[PDB]
Amino acid sequence: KRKNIALIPAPKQYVEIGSKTVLEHVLGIFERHEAVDLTVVVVSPEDTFADKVQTAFPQVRVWKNGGQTRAETVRNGVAKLLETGLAAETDNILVHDAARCCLPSEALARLIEQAGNAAEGGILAVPVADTLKRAESGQISATVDRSGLWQAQTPQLFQAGLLHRALAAITDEASAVEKLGVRPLLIQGDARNLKLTQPQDAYIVRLLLD
Amino acid sequence: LKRKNIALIPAAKQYVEIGSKTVLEHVLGIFERHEAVDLTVVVVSPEDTFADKVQTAFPQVRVWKNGGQTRAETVRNGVAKLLETGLAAETDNILVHDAARCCLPSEALARLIEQAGNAAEGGILAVPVADTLKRAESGQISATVDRSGLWQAQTPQLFQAGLLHRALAAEITDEASAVEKLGVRPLLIQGDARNLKLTQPQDAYIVRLLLD
């Protein structure tokens, strides 16, 4: 009865890869996933291409009311899901990155299975493998202890009400929730669930999709 | 007599069969086909059973059966025998590389040697931390750590043999940290996303997929 709403705040989401753009590959994962009950994508007011995404995914909702920053648009999205009746305060919101278009099904599964029924919420993440270094101006100014450190991935699953309190007044959704006194879980993410930031990342993604 | 570039691979699972050759064979292949790399050594443990057949595919490469009990130790042993045997002069570059990073781009290694090769301090291949970092506590997030100006170290780690030799004798997870404790600040050279270390089963998928 409690729903699982995918929320995707949405510049490489339009890249052509395979046959569809990055976003199309992202929506596909959520809309084809059993556990996910609904998927919403917040785009900017005058987002010229979003319109065409809507015609491939009618069940998905493309609201043209984004903010100037990721943080803001997630806020807007959650406040229109709550304020419309689509999401009850206790419904789960899975915020996902527009560019992580290689999210395994069993990873998403896993998030919902361990974070879905945990008040605190949960985030997909992988343990820091590599030694960490603090750069200064091209040079190593120090080594930071990676002891018990994890790299956060999306999606980040939290109750809509909790999430709405959280963002109401600082990099991810989880950081907002940790500021309340709530410790979200850390769920094994995935190596292939990488964000397409650099051109170098496109290669591995294209290779992953196809 | 020009300054060399000696790849050093501490290898005391690098034996995973992927493609047609094992992980190690794919690593050695990168260094042995690379122009700028003058020599490639691999330190395996005393009684390593499968190192011998690696030698037969790479005669120029040298497999010394004298590893330590720990990565740090064996790198130390290898650098000490490269110096103590005359193969490497104090000013010669030693590129330590992870036995399991079998997807090192050629231009990446090229780049390391081009920017760290003639820089006393040394250098390491690394990529900036993209993702928010979180401090776990026992399955939960106990704190978010600022990723501002942080990089993820990769291999190889290129340093003069002598410097390296001083560094390791001191007494701390990678080579760079050892040189950093000398007052030396090794550079940060753009590494590669594909230059990933095969540690979990989930990585093999991506690696196999990369060696195609």
Q: What is the DSSP string of A11-46?
A: --TT-EETTEEHHHHHHHHHHT-TT--EEEEE--TT
- Partner-chain contact B137 A148, CB within 8 Å: yes
Do B174 and A135 count as a contact with CB atoms less than 8 A apart? no
Residues in chain B after which the backbone breaks (C–N beyond 2.5 Å): 12, 171
Cα A137–Cα A140–Cα A145 angle in degrees, nearest 5: 130
Shortest CB distance from A125 goes to which of B134, B185, B200?
B134
**B93 φ, ψ to 5°?**
-75, 130
User: How close B198 gets to chain A, by Cα (Å)?
Assistant: 10
Q: Is the bond leading into A155 cis (omega within 30 degrees of zero)?
A: yes
Using DSSP, how many helices (H) and how many strands (E) does chain B show? 7, 11
Question: Looking at the 3D structure of chain B, how many domains does it have?
Answer: 1
Q: Which of B98, B115, B134, B148 to mutate to test the interface with A (most CBs of A within 10 A)?
A: B134
Beta bridge partners of A139: B187
B139 torsion bin: left (phi>0), alpha (psi -120 to 50), beta (else): left
Name the residue among B144, B150, B192 with its Cβ closest to that of A144. Answer: B150
Element (H, E) at A90: none
Residues 186-205 of A with CB under 8 A from B: 186, 190-192, 194-195, 197-198, 200-201, 203-204
Torsion angle of C-alpha atoms A194, B95, B113, B91, degrees rounded to 10: 150
- Alpha-carbon gap: B52 to the closest alpha carbon of chain A (Å): 30
- DSSP, collapsed to helix, strand or coil, labels residue A147 as coil
Contact A95, B114 (CB under 8 A): no
Q: What is the CATH number of the domain that holds B113?
A: 3.90.550.10
The span from the CA of B212 to the CA of A45, in Å, is 43
Nearest Cα residue to B117 out of B193, B4, B200, B1: B4
* H helix intervals, B16-158: 23-32, 52-55, 71-83, 106-116
CA distance B136 to chain A (A): 6
3-state SS assignment for residue A202: helix
- Distances B120 to A172, B3, B96, B117, B164 between C-alpha atoms, Å: 39, 12, 16, 8, 11
**How far apart (Å, rounded) are the C-alpha atoms in residues A107 and A185?**
14
B-chain residues near A114 (CB < 8 A): none
Residues in chain A: 210
Which of 13-42 (B) contact A at CB < 8 A?
Answer: none
User: CB neighbours of A203 closer than 8 A, spacing ≥ 6?
Assistant: B193, B194
H runs (alpha helix) in chain B: 23-32, 52-55, 71-83, 106-116, 161-169, 175-180, 201-210
The full length of chain B comes to 212
- Name, in order, each residue with C-beta under 8 angstroms of B85's C-beta and a sequence gap of 6 or more: none
Q: What residues of chain B lie within 8 A of the CB of A184, using their CB?
A: 140-141
Select from B132, B139, B154 the Cβ nearest to the Cβ of A185: B139
What are the C-alpha distances in Å from A55 to residues A29, A51, A61, B202?
17, 7, 10, 35
Residue B132's domain spans which residues? 1-212
Residues of A in contact with B128 (CB under 8 A): 135
- CA–CA separation, A87 vs A93, rounded Å? 8
From the list B143, B209, B128, the residue with the least C-alpha distance to A135 is: B128
**Residue from the list B121, B141, B202 with its beta carbon closest to the beta carbon of A190:** B202
User: Please, which residues 110-129 of chain B have a Cβ atom closer than 8 Å to chain A?
Assistant: 121, 124, 126, 128-129
**B205 contacts in A (CB within 8 Å)?**
191-192
Tell me, yes or no, if A169 comes closer than 8 A to chain B by beta carbon: no
Q: Do B139 and A198 touch (CB under 8 A)?
A: no
- Candidates A69, A149, A139, A195; CA nearest to B149 is A139
**A144, A186, A190: residue with CB nearest B134:** A186
- Inter-chain touch B133–A148, beta carbons under 8 Å: no
Contact between B198 and B23 (Cβ < 8 Å):
yes
- How would you classify residue A91: left for phi > 0, otherwise alpha for psi between -120 and 50, otherwise beta? beta
Neighbours of B210 (CB within 10 A): 19
Method: X-ray
Are B176 and A128 an interchain contact pair (Cβ–Cβ within 8 Å)? no
Strand B39-43 and strand B5-10: pairing? parallel
Q: Taking the CB of residue A159, how many other CB atoms lie within 10 A of it?
A: 23
Resolution (A): 3.0
Q: Which of A10, A181, A31 is nearest to A99 (CA)?
A: A10
> Would you call B66 helix, strand, or coil by DSSP?
coil
What sections of chain A are H helices per DSSP?
A: 22-31, 50-54, 70-82, 105-115, 160-167, 173-178, 199-209
B3 backbone dihedrals φ, ψ, rounded to 5°: -70, 130
Q: Please check whether residue A91 is in contact with residue A159, taking contact to mean a CB–CB distance below 8 angstroms.
A: yes
